[PDB]
Ligand binder design. Structure first.
Ligand code: S9S
Ligand code: S9S
Lengths: 265, 265
């Protein structure tokens, strides 16, 4: 992978692997999410960030955390195919940062998917949200386009929709979900792609066998610890739409909420 | 990736990804196992296979893993290039063996090696059978005729008989269930999931202070999508040895058994 001519965005080509595909021999939505994560890490590596916290973020125990992740896929890359992903960042004033992705077929050059994520500042010890100071902004703005560049431009689009809380009783459920060591990242925290998988575990197998995931919007409220147990809840709201909710199996503490949209194969 | 000059082996280079590493910022033993699987699939793709030969498809026969043995000296770091070479060999009428050599792409030194024993089996009834002559001729033209062993040594650990773990186990991880990410393209549980499940009963203190040097896994039964697994471990031993056993949470039906060897960091 490499930064573009202007150094204000990064591109990388990936060859879809055998174990990265589902029953239809195309990459899963979790393989795609992992690829988005990898190109994002490589973009921060290429612009100076060590093994993406700035200088002011290190002195003050501050980290970027995901608050929302929205993905729209038109075509899932087949096993053995090359997918090209372009990623960039933009300041959202004092609220935080946004990271966008464009997925293209390396052969045809056509856009096959797009994603957007909203990140907020947070103390890594107390977990208190806070806001992007002023000294922090100057350190990362030199790597962002100043003019807006939105993967989801549309006025009144799916990525900025308010998601309600799933009302009990849920239509479907997957209980007793626990992260293993493969679900953890290098910092021993549950990887954000695991939550996508957990949300999709309560979708019935018949829906998965006859439909394809077109859109998925996930809101992150709290982190699931290594020793926490999760319940995954789904209710049809409708193409098929679903409302989702992940909560701790014990006290019922909310960790995630979202929506999915599926299309007949 | 590409076949060697003689067309009797295949090589492929991989760049270790961000989400593929553990707490030490080096690839996990499951990332390595997935890479071995990917280069094996690409080797079969490059030599004509659309795993199954013309006679195997006529008879509804498939290759299944009976044993997997991996020995790692160095785990590739995040961002590093690992080069893996793989080949196959006929084991008379017992079945086939697939071997792997892992090298550092910069230094050229061997950093790991693996060996697997595959047996012939009816896809439908699940009954094992010897390799017939007509099947042998179809795949022999892609194997070296002279032996080429990744583990040559006279009394080596890859051919050791593994005993059954006696109850009560020293350690345990109960209620393990595969999710959709744990399934392959044919909706069967991927063999790397069993490695992860075996390692779930190893205490976190052992994982934090030691590195996995050797792992030998014997496959007795396939775990279904709706099956629940219990993972059992007992210390058998500067170095630490463990005896492992995976069994169905209900009836206690054996699905896997193995051993691991760890070294102080
Ligand atoms: C939360 S993030 O969007 O992943 N990173 C914000 C800081 C950054 C800004 C521009 C970069 F080229 C790399 C990192
Ligand atoms: C993957 S295997 O079950 O270990 N071997 C099957 C036969 C084969 C032999 C040589 C090849 F180049 C590819 C496949």
């Amino acid at each position: 992978g490499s930064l573009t001519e202007d150094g204000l965005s990064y591109k990388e080509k990936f060859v879809v692997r055998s174990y990265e595909v589902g029953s239809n021999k195309t990459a899963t939505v979790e393989t795609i999410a992992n690829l988005l994560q990898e190109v994002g890490c490589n973009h921060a590596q290429s612009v100076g960030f060590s093994t993406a916290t700035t200088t002011t973020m290190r002195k003050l125990h501050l980290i970027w955390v995901t608050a929302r992740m929205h993905i729209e896929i038109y075509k899932y890359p087949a096993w053995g195919d090359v997918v090209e992903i372009e990623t960039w960042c933009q300041s959202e004033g004092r609220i935080g940062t946004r990271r966008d992705w464009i997925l293209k077929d390396s052969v045809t050059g056509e856009v096959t998917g797009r994603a957007t994520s909203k990140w907020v500042m947070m103390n890594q010890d107390t977990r208190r949200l806070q806001k992007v100071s002023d000294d922090v902004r100057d350190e990362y703005l030199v790597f962002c386009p100043q003019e807006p560049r939105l993967a989801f431009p549309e006025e009144n689009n799916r990525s900025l929709k308010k998601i309600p809380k799933l009302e009990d009783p849920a239509q479907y459920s997957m209980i007793g979900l626990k992260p293993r060591r493969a679900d953890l990242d290098m910092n021993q925290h549950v990887n954000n792609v695991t939550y996508i998988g957990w949300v999709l575990e309560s979708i019935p197998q018949e829906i998965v066998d006859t439909h394809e995931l077109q859109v998925i919007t996930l809101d992150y409220r709290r982190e699931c610890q290594q020793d926490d147990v999760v319940d995954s809840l789904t209710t049809t709201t409708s193409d098929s739409q679903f409302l989702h909710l992940l909560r701790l199996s014990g006290d019922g503490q909310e960790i995630n909420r979202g929506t999915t949209l599926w299309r007949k194969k």
